[PDB]
DNA sequence: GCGATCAGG
DNA sequence: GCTGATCGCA
């Protein structure tokens, strides 16, 4: 049953063809500055495997690898493209990535290996990675002739399924959702990630001095106000302090305890002033140990950069994900943790950094696809949202719009666009699921385009079996014909959803695409870092900045062209945090 | 390894 | 509502 192929000791010409399969592979699951332990070549004249220390000498691989012309067909381009970027390697000519192309067919399935994507069409000849590595301290790269023949089965199967992936998009409509937007997305963010973001350690290191002082404080305050010392960061220990010795109310309770999170200790503060500290430590724990320390972790010694990786083939909703460090989901809204983003600075001196974010994409994209009358008209008067949307479920004037109800109105839009049940809405609001329930109908009758949506789209879902995006994304619901209210609820609000953020994930993904395009015509040395869902953060020369106020702006807003205009504010400054 | 927690959009 | 990082405890 074994594969045949040549285990090559030198490259040659036939390896060189204008078309072929190949594995360029990275054991380490965080792929930068990481070993390349084999090479795998499939074309129309064989299988090869080649050592990497062979191939990565040989002038004419190197420049084959690097010619457009000559294309290559691989699973997860990204990583191979990342690691040969540490190595002054260029990968170009990548027309087709297994990885995105399983991914655009169905997010749900998972693929993470090859052996994944090929069982989707009946191909098994291929072991999954696990198998072959192991997993955990037991992970680790097989003999030259294991690793070989997995190599090489892996570019066989490249080989076998391009055709049929290709030809299954191509029904689904997502030719070039593949090839003019995840393909060229992938070059993108392999740029971005091999960049990285400079950070200020010193600056880090002094943060993390200062709240080590000030989370010192405060759990000897907590064990004062107990009585007692204890691990406070045991919701175990912490909840015999609270619910026993204390006897403080048990408003809610978790799957094997007492519920300590933090929108239930808000309601147990007039109690005892222990609740208080204990939500302060809990914040200042936050930034100490994810923030400081764990950022620190990550942070590249000679270079002091960090380098995320940006998961593309995750979401089912077309959103991308960050890891090691996840650099999306940095602190913001509290001054204390946004401080935090004062240690993102400029790579180069006398650089700059410049955030664009969209103003609204959801609620704009969610007036496009509905084309309600009353949301499309308030987006083109460009109004607050959320004052506008207060003003027509409560029935009053501008003038009369109190920031009471400003707010409600405002998680009433949060949660139309994370489509969140009325269940979340009550909890959010604090308020009973009734009352929410009121507040949705409410809604629907100031914009009745949208509850038409909201039916026809749930209705749509159950009829084909699947949502689309605004650029032929997809997302299956086989749950939305479930028999269990709950489980049919879910999938009704996904069924809702992905169309709005989908959408507004294919719009920035464009964008990007877009704007490298632009930043290269005009000659800029201004590049982008990260993308955070809505909002597109780079790093350019002071005497770039005039022009990145006009650029990067109009980019973005004319990515798509939608029933309502798109908006984009931007700001730019010394760090990420002055970017305000 | 996995539940409980909390950060962002 | 989701994804990722942390912790404590299995
Ligand atoms: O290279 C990223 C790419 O690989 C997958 C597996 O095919 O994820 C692996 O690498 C990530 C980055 O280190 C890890 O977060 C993940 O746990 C690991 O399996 C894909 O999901 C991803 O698109
Ligand atoms: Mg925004």
Known sequence: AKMAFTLADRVTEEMLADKAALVVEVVEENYHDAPIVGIA??????????????????????????????????????????????????????????????????????????????????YEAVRPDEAVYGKGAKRAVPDEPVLAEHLVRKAAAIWELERPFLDELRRNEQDRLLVELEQPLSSILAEMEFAGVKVDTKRLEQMGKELAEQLGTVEQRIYELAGQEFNINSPKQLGVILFEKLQLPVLKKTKTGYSTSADVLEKLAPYHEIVENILHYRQLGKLQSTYIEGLLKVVRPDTKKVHTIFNQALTQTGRLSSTEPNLQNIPIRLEEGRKIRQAFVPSESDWLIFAADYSQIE?????????????????????????????????????????????????????????????????????????????????????????????????????????????????????????????????????????????????????????????????LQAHLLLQVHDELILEAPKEEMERLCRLVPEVMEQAVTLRVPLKVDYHYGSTWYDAK
């Open 41 to 122: 070549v499939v074309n129309e004249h064989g299988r090869f495997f080649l050592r990497p220390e062979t191939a990565l000498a040989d002038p004419q691989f190197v420049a084959w690898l690097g010619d457009e012309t000559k294309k290559k067909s691989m699973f997860d381009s990204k990583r191979a493209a990342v690691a040969l970027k540490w190595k002054g390697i260029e990968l170009c000519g990548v027309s087709f990535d297994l990885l995105l192309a399983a991914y655009l067919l169905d997010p749900a399935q998972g693929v993470d290996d090859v052996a994944a994507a090929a069982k989707m069409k009946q």
């Open 363 to 523: 609620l704009r994209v969610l007036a496009h696809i509905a084309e309600d009358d009353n949301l499309m008209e308030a987006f083109r008067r460009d109004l607050d949202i959320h004052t506008k949307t207060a003003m027509d479920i409560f029935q009053v004037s501008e003038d009369e719009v109190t920031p009471n109800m400003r707010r409600q109105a405002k998680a009433v839009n949060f949660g139309i666009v994370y489509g969140i049940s009325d269940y979340g809405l009550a909890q959010n609001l604090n308020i009973s699921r009734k009352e929410a329930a009121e507040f949705i109908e409410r809604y629907f009758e100031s914009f009745p385009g949208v509850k038409r949506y909201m039916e026809n789209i749930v209705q749509e879902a159950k009829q084909k079996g699947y949502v689309t995006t605004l650029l032929h994304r997809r997302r299956y619901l086989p749950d939305i014909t479930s028999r269990n209210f709950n489980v049919r609820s879910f999938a009704e609000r996904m069924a809702m959803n992905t169309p709005i953020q989908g959408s507004a994930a294919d719009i920035i993904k464009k964008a990007m695409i877009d704007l490298n395009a632009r930043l290269k015509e005009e000659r």
